[PDB]
Write a protein that binds this ligand. Structure first.
Ligand SMILES: *[C@@H]1O[C@H](CO)[C@@H](O[C@@H]2O[C@H](CO)[C@@H](O[C@@H]3O[C@H](CO)[C@@H](O)[C@H](O)[C@@H]3O)[C@H](O)[C@H]2NC(C)=O)[C@H](O)[C@H]1NC(C)=O
Ligand SMILES: *[C@@H]1O[C@H](CO)[C@@H](O[C@@H]2O[C@H](CO)[C@@H](O[C@@H]3O[C@H](CO)[C@@H](O)[C@H](O)[C@@H]3O)[C@H](O)[C@H]2NC(C)=O)[C@H](O)[C@H]1NC(C)=O
Ligand SMILES: *[C@@H]1O[C@H](CO)[C@@H](O[C@@H]2O[C@H](CO)[C@@H](O[C@@H]3O[C@H](CO)[C@@H](O)[C@H](O)[C@@H]3O)[C@H](O)[C@H]2NC(C)=O)[C@H](O)[C@H]1NC(C)=O
Ligand SMILES: *[C@@H]1O[C@H](CO)[C@@H](O)[C@H](O)[C@H]1NC(C)=O
Ligand SMILES: *[C@@H]1O[C@H](CO)[C@@H](O)[C@H](O)[C@H]1NC(C)=O
Ligand SMILES: *[C@@H]1O[C@H](CO)[C@@H](O)[C@H](O)[C@H]1NC(C)=O
Ligand SMILES: *[C@@H]1O[C@H](CO)[C@@H](O)[C@H](O)[C@H]1NC(C)=O
Ligand SMILES: *[C@@H]1O[C@H](CO)[C@@H](O)[C@H](O)[C@H]1NC(C)=O
Ligand SMILES: *[C@@H]1O[C@H](CO)[C@@H](O)[C@H](O)[C@H]1NC(C)=O
Ligand SMILES: *[C@@H]1O[C@H](CO)[C@@H](O)[C@H](O)[C@H]1NC(C)=O
Ligand SMILES: *[C@@H]1O[C@H](CO)[C@@H](O)[C@H](O)[C@H]1NC(C)=O
Ligand SMILES: *[C@@H]1O[C@H](CO)[C@@H](O)[C@H](O)[C@H]1NC(C)=O
Ligand SMILES: *[C@@H]1O[C@H](CO)[C@@H](O)[C@H](O)[C@H]1NC(C)=O
Ligand SMILES: *[C@@H]1O[C@H](CO)[C@@H](O)[C@H](O)[C@H]1NC(C)=O
Ligand SMILES: *[C@@H]1O[C@H](CO)[C@@H](O)[C@H](O)[C@H]1NC(C)=O
Lengths: 328, 175, 328, 175, 328, 175
């Protein structure tokens, strides 16, 4: 080997691991605060405060709700034929036309909100025997009276309101949405003044369905000078089907159809400012980054967003236990 | 944790080791010295990143959903809309809470493991020439200069080269 | 160092762990019965059998359902202006006044049940031209006939039933709940005897909504001497809005409003006895202790309760494996 | 379990050890003895209690919810009210079933670990003076009276004090 | 002791584990592709393509939907008194009798679908003063006109339609389902031709409930020669209760009751072929084997089936890591 | 995995071992051989089957449920029918994804464990007569014929029978 290898010395070798002065507490199966070297936060808890206008198509409703934009309130005429990925409704929105109510408001708002388009096609309905284009001073269009742009108020001509019986075939290859309504007068006098018959009736049908609504006379609260109301209804007509509108008084007629589509559109109520920035996740509190897996900003989201969780902090340990060597 | 190296037979960490997560300090002929071990550091780091990426894997996207805030009182249907969401949120919150607890538990045993594995690997290499002082340090019973220390660390140490010197020093003595 | 230790012997040191004679079987990722030293049960599977009357305010409905307590069935007059955290409805409850039906019974029972109060404020409605306080022998109050305490049955005065058109503003800063109804007569003769007009009509509205119901004449099954029915409806009037009630016959008028609140109240159907004890978790089977995390007593709960689970036992190992030394 | 001490190299437990979960039985010049080890017993107990408290952490409270029992047949809406609840119950039952299975599995490896850690700790302390008989018992190759057994147990044993006596007894013999 | 005699040598013993040439990649907590010796698939992703006719009682609706089988469309007379565990509705089903609509079609289809029986009991209703068994050329039964087998169209006798007021007690110990309807004429002339009265009315009631429907005159789209429609309604009568049917025109009367039961029956829309084989899990794509825990064939199932999951493959490692001698 | 035997101190598997999952290879003065170890193979296999059976335990059955495909647009109630199902499917998919990830992770550490346990068991048996070469092979310092190799494998090896031969060969040499 060598010869008498005599140098009798020894060495010491010690294995160890790092430690940091600072360190973060994390929960464990057996402890709920144990200190580790480093951790990463898994709950997104803050919004920017602004809805980024990119990549989704945000439509700011300004002072129009989606239903008024649909119906064609004069002050919402800006939105005709408009489209959106997300329609934002503001708390300040107001209606300012003939007082109306929508029996299943919530389903009509939903159903239009995800169709994502207000594209309207005017169709040639021929109303013989009645006076078209009735308008009201509670729905001012410009200096004059007015009405919803997408609805047509029929009243008597001379001394008669005939039985209207019109038809409109769906010959295209897509579904058609028809918004129509019925007028509820305040007095029997108003009823006969406008529609002659003392009891109106509207029946709208397809091969598949039928709605007959009869009006209801009576005073409601004064809203923009009026005690009368119109109630809104909708009928979808499938390709190959046919719409038949039959009435004997009180019909607020459709002017054509909205076209329906299938997509990723929705609606959101938020007063957050829209701003220019790209962000995939939208919350009514403004956009948030979807880099973390969970979020605690709002249970309402649109887009690629983290899963909402009740917790506001969840730290995932990304290091070993911190066992410091003093702590400095 | 499960292996009892970190916060176990190794009393505490070294705040001074800034170049790696696991490593060696030695005191020898030329003096004292420290050095990070990069293979076990990388092994610990890679597993923690793997775990990390799996957790950040795809936020799914949702578009039109159900309403979650209401301004009028409606009764039966709104009660259900609220109940579906509240039971969805509690289930996802349970999931988040359990996921980080299992994960963290495992990250602590995984790193405890790599420490112990590096210890065992060094043990096996020194063979009959060292003894465990039981605190994560080996007593090397033969002259081991800085290149000898570096061969243990870089894994090329040949025990045979020092076996008789070591065995003599270690056993013979006077008993 | 030391001198000749003449004797040089050895010792034996053995490490071991405890074991118990008894031991419990538990499930595992890899085994479904493995024996451990000790375990703890995580599923609560037994009720006391009694609803503890503390800490929640339990209201025992005795033989009144919540809707009859609301309407003011004579036999439920005990509950006027009463409040609750949990209203318990008993299987023995019975109605014993004018035969009525509630179109969306389930939403009205829910909506009152979580408001948690039957506080009623009488308002000065002035019904001119009709006879107030109609009562019936199917709703005996004391020796005499009677009606629901919170409703007012209007019939004609002399030879006329006018068109009623009344209004009641919500000037307070809270929502008001109005319960009203409509009478369906059995015969056209009954209709004209009471309301003169051969076709009644009730329209109740606010700035936001309107309901017009028209009665329906016809014989129903004899219930407490009657074939007629009244159907119950409700209108909530928000602060600043206004109620307008307009009718021409068959109106069962409100006497004022119930006030609504927001709280933790609910309703529960149970025949369990109420008893004095404090218990946070209530189940229709009686209270149960919420010390365990899961429970299997009932899927219906109120309060701080364990999560209902299909399993009736889940043992959590609280000790090591039991490896005993004797045989079995 | 994962370490192979309990129900592994240690053949079985001691029904007679009533004072601790892990411990020592010796035979030395002065006689035989048993003694619980309180540090590893406390280590095992604390982790199991920690785990236990996390599981019993806050029953959340729920007040007005949806109806869950119905007396008339209604169709579409009642079908949904029943389906929301039945899918909520299966999800929570899956959660309970998985939670105790993972937990129990871990409790058995955790306690197996503490046994093995106490074994290793004692090994490291006895240094060159004992040999593992492979059944969880060490053969101490030097005279070790009751106070010597006590010093191993309370962790103050100095191997150097007996090293030559031990090394002689252990190796030299006749080969 | 043991005496070597002469030889002086050593041996080598090495421990190792197997490895396979092939090997499968699996996901892990820390890796998403790690190679193991063997794995097993947990997601069932393929159907046989056929609905096995065993063990559940499959009823193939052929070209009848369940509601037409119920009502008794001539072409669905095959299904009278039939029963099922699963009723399969085909995309080809067509109706071919009097044009009708069902206000809550979805609840009636559900409610019959899980009752699982079309068992019908004819009861002796006595309609005095009207002409029974009206039938139509849009519902051809054989060469002649016809109507739904389970419904009875009453029209006037001579010059009068009386007020019908009939009653049928539920004296049995089970619930009775009554399907009845109302006719909406196209013209006022049709109304008076058939029912004399210019405004019909149907009220069906029990001690617990009442429905009054009034017809709606107007033209709908031509369907099988007709613009009129009948709308279908249902009343369940509990043991001890009583049905009272009261009408003055337009009643399409019940002929008796369907009996209701409680069971595991349901309905499924599928064009999959039924075949002979035993399979517990049915999917509209055909039966699938429930040996795996999760499935990705369809979210619609009936029977003992795997849990539907979005993933189409999830491999469970059933072996150690594969560390081969050469490569993979 | 956690123990560092498989894909750890044991460099790689043997594609040639077809008769068991874990086993022995040896070279002595009479030849070379291989042999599977059936006890650790069965231990690994049984745990993996136990795990497997628990996962395939009872598909629950469901009969009438809610509609999940719709042909007309309805609004509020159909939006809820769709949302209940979509949140049920994401919750069960999360569960399936987490279940196989935990399971697989554990199956790799469990098999790593059995390898290391068989190694330790053989270590303990050979006592002072062998040394660990650190690659999963022991150097047996005494003549060990095929029946001697068989006794280590079947667990009946008596170290005392060869202790002086071994200790001589192992230590004495010339240092
Ligand atoms: C039925 O009863 C209601 C409630 O009493 C009557 O409503 C009230 O009718 C008056 C007269 O048209 C409304 O007056 C107008 O109010 C506005 C704002 O104050 C003011 O600018 C006008 O000069 C006028 O005062 C009053 O607002 C309205 N109130 C409500 C709550 O609607 C209704 O007229 C009665 N109808 C019949 C036919 O008897
Ligand atoms: C319409 O038809 C129904 C059913 O046939 C008639 O109902 C029945 O009317 C009679 C006479 O009022 C009721 O008699 C009562 O019986 C009770 C005992 O149950 C008794 O205490 C009363 O003194 C009286 O005798 C009978 O109960 C009732 N049955 C049902 C099921 O309601 C109804 O009278 C008919 N109406 C007309 C206007 O034709
Ligand atoms: C109310 O308006 C509707 C729509 O214009 C009218 O419906 C149409 O009525 C005609 C005459 O009955 C139907 O014609 C028949 O069609 C069948 C199939 O082509 C054919 O066999 C007959 O020879 C005849 O042509 C037509 O199909 C029908 N169209 C629709 C969409 O229903 C209805 O007649 C009007 N009613 C009144 C009272 O004015
Ligand atoms: C802590 O962990 C996160 C995620 O692994 C990483 O980005 C960060 O740099 C780590 N901190 C340090 C000081 O390494
Ligand atoms: C809306 O779009 C349709 C389809 O191109 C078009 O015919 C119509 O005139 C448009 N109207 C407005 C106001 O843009
Ligand atoms: C988000 O918005 C909701 C409602 O507007 C509010 O209660 C919540 O605290 C907000 N959270 C954050 C992080 O902005
Ligand atoms: C290991 O260290 C010794 C001393 O520095 C050196 O000669 C040898 O080449 C090193 N080997 C490697 C692979 O670094
Ligand atoms: C069993 O475990 C429970 C919970 O840790 C504890 O209360 C109980 O005292 C234990 N049993 C024994 C005998 O220690
Ligand atoms: C109910 O409470 C209101 C508000 O204090 C009170 O005016 C009314 O008289 C009370 N009536 C009864 C019967 O207690
Ligand atoms: C609780 O009550 C329900 C319904 O009353 C009953 O089926 C169940 O078995 C009861 N369970 C217990 C533990 O009382
Ligand atoms: C350990 O045991 C020895 C003998 O009983 C005793 O002298 C010594 O002080 C003990 N040390 C401790 C810390 O108990
Ligand atoms: C793979 O695992 C499955 C389930 O344990 C088993 O049926 C199959 O036979 C295994 N493959 C081999 C080659 O052992
Ligand atoms: C249907 O079953 C009932 C009950 O047995 C029977 O009276 C009736 O005649 C049956 N009708 C047919 C068409 O099978
Ligand atoms: C099952 O059927 C659905 C709808 O018919 C189809 O989209 C899906 O891809 C099919 N899957 C399989 C495995 O057949
Ligand atoms: C172990 O191996 C030796 C040599 O083959 C044999 O004599 C002995 O009986 C074996 N023991 C067992 C239990 O197989």
């Amino acid at each position: 080997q060598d010869l008498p290898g005599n140098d009798n010395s020894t060495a010491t070798l010690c294995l160890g691991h790092h430690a940091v002065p600072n360190g973060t507490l994390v929960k464990t199966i057996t402890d709920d605060q144990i200190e580790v070297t480093n951790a990463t936060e898994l709950v997104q808890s803050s919004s920017t405060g602004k809805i980024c206008n990119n990549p989704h198509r945000i439509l700011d409703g300004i002072d129009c709700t989606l239903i008024d934009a649909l119906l064609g309130d004069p002050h919402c005429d800006v939105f005709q034929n408009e489209t959106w990925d997300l329609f934002v409704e503001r708390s300040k929105a107001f209606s300012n036309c003939y007082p109306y109510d929508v029996p299943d408001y919530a389903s009509l708002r939903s159903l239009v909100a995800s169709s994502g388009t207000l594209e309207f096609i005017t169709e040639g309905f021929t109303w013989t025997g009645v006076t078209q284009n009735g308008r009201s001073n509670a729905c001012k269009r410009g200096p004059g009276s007015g009405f919803f742009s997408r609805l047509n108020w029929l009243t008597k001509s001379g001394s008669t309101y005939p039985v209207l019986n019109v038809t409109m075939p769906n010959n295209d290859n897509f579904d058609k949405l028809y918004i129509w309504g019925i007028h509820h007068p305040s007095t029997n006098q108003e009823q006969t003044s406008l529609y002659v018959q003392a009891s109106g009736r509207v029946t709208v049908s397809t091969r598949r369905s039928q709605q007959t609504i009869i009006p209801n006379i009576g005073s409601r609260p004064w809203v923009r000078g009026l005690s009368s109301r119109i109630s809104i209804y909708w009928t979808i007509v499938k390709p190959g089907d046919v719409l038949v509108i039959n009435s004997n008084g009180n019909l607020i007629a459709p002017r054509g159809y909205f076209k329906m589509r299938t997509g990723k559109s929705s609606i959101m109520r938020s007063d957050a400012p829209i701003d220019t920035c790209i962000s995939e996740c939208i919350t009514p509190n403004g956009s948030i980054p979807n880099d973390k897996p969970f979020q605690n900003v709002n249970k309402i989201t649109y887009g690629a967003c983290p899963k909402y969780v009740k917790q506001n902090t969840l730290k995932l340990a990304t290091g070993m236990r911190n066992v410091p060597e003093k702590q400095t | 944790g499960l292996f009892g190296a970190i916060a176990g037979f190794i009393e505490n960490g070294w705040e001074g080791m800034i170049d790696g997560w696991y490593g060696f300090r030695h005191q020898n002929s030329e003096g004292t010295g420290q050095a990070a071990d990069l293979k076990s550091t990388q092994a610990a780091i890679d597993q923690i990143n793997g775990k990390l990426n799996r957790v950040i894997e795809k936020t799914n996207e949702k578009f039109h959903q159900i309403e979650k805030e209401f301004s009028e009182v409606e009764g039966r249907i709104q009660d259900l809309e609220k109940y579906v969401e509240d039971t969805k949120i509690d289930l996802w919150s349970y999931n988040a809470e359990l996921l980080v607890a299992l994960e963290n538990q495992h990250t602590i045993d995984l790193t405890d493991s790599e420490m112990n594995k590096l210890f065992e690997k060094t043990r096996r290499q020194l063979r009959e020439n060292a003894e465990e002082m039981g605190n994560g340090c080996f007593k090397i019973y033969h002259k081991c200069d800085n290149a000898c220390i570096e061969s243990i660390r870089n894994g090329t140490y040949d025990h045979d080269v020092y076996r008789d010197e070591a065995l003599n020093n270690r056993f013979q003595i006077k008993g």
